[PDB]
């Protein structure tokens, strides 16, 4: 679907709801980082289990680096079509292009599934 450049693959709608639902459990229980740069550190630091990425983001630049950065770091990442939903999932009023779940909690079985599902979707 929409948004190109760094989006290699289309995440189905059912996957995306499960991902967004894990993100809400993740804020309550565990830890989450909200915003592009924090997600960037989180990957560099090695703190992040799963990074989530909004599709509509314009200019692309803010975003562009995260899937190949993530590849080296071994962190799996999954794509969300709307940003507003992502900020919302994160637990906040405004949108977010990118968020990172830094260590889940009770989500751990779901996040591990999302992570395998994406690799199974595309390596």
């Amino acid at each position: 679907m929409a948004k190109p450049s760094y989006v290699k693959f289309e995440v189905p709608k059912e996957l995306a709801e499960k991902a967004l639902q894990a993100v809400e459990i993740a804020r309550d229980t565990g830890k989450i980082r909200k915003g592009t740069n924090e997600t960037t550190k989180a990957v560099e630091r090695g703190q992040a289990k799963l990074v989530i990425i909004a599709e509509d983001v314009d200019p692309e630049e803010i975003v562009a680096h995260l899937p190949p950065l993530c590849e080296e770091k071994e962190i799996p990442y999954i794509y969300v079509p709307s940003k507003k939903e992502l900020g919302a999932a994160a637990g906040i009023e405004v949108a977010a292009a990118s968020v990172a779940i830094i260590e889940p909690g009770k989500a751990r079985d779901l996040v591990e599934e999302i992570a395998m599902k994406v690799k199974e979707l595309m390596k």
Binding site: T36, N37, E38, T39, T40, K41, E44, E61, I62, A64, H65, L69
Partner: peptide, 12 residues
């Protein structure tokens, strides 16, 4: 370090 430097340098 951090996100900003990567984008800026990639634009270079």
């Amino acid at each position: 370090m951090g996100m900003y430097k990567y984008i800026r340098e990639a634009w270079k």
